[PDB]
Amino acid sequence: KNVKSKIGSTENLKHQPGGGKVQIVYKPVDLSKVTSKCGSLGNIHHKPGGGQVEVKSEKLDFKDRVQSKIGSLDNITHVPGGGNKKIETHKLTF
């Protein structure tokens, strides 16, 4: 069991604001094969090129305003537990 409650609250929540989440996996596999039997070869030049990976974030401008106004919280009964009995809240004004 999982219970979450909010009454009259204010939240500002951000995950990785500026640059975000970046995940890069670089795993090329090379299985080239040169074979010779009973013959003649010249020179071998094995010169394969590597990859380029680039991730960039240049000129970001992020601006937030959060405002909350409540006149009054009063006379609240909040029972997220179980098996309770005879819970009371009273208010009187003259």
Author numbering: 254 to 274, 306 to 378
Show sentences the authors wrote.
Six Tau isoforms that range from 352 to 441 amino acids are expressed in adult human brains and are produced by alternative mRNA splicing of MAPT, the Tau gene. Inclusion of exon 10 results in the production of three Tau isoforms with 4 repeats (4R), and its exclusion in another three isoforms with 3 repeats (3R). In Pick’s disease, only 3R Tau is present in the disease filaments, with the Pick fold being extended and two-layered.
Filament structures were determined to a resolution of 2.6 Å, which was sufficient for atomic modelling. The extended and two-layered filament core is identical to the Pick fold, comprising 9 β-strands. Identical filament folds were present in grey matter of temporal cortex from case 1 and grey and white matter of frontal cortex from case 2. We now show that mutation ∆K281 in MAPT causes an inherited form of Pick’s disease, indicating that relative overproduction of 3R Tau is sufficient to give rise to the Pick fold.
